[PDB]
Write a protein that binds this ligand. Sequence first.
Ligand SMILES: O=C(O)[C@H]1CCCN1C(=O)Nc1cc(Cl)cc(Cl)c1-c1ccccc1
Length: 133
Amino acid sequence: HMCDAFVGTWKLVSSENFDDYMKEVGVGFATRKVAGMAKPNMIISVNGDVITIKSESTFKNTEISFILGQEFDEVTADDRKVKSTITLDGGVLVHVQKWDGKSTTIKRKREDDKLVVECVMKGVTSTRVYERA
Ligand SMILES: O=C(O)[C@H]1CCCN1C(=O)Nc1cc(Cl)cc(Cl)c1-c1ccccc1
């Protein structure tokens, strides 16, 4: 029951500072502009200890499956090859991605009926707000 309140199908409804977050990460112009239009569906499910998170949109369909605390390989929507570790900290899913000596953290939090996603790269934060689909 570790992630019960995250499980479901969620749809992006608002974004703030996302272009600047992508810039900070190193995403190129064309990907930023196209990817910035997308309104992804985030689909979270749990089976035993395995959590699966899918992101489906016009831009890209991605899927990760993982066990909390156990590092895995991930190819991100913007084609970075990263080493990812996802943990639960005080009820927040904390996803750290490492590549090329860089690091970014993505936090997923339940707030009221929303799932609020905070993406941080150095001093730049972006907030992506999802509602139930
Ligand atoms: O898209 C999101 O809301 C954020 C928070 C959850 C994971 N996530 C990303 O990895 N976003 C993204 C993060 C980066 Cl640096 C670049 C892109 Cl292209 C996306 C992206 C954009 C549109 C659709 C899919 C991915």
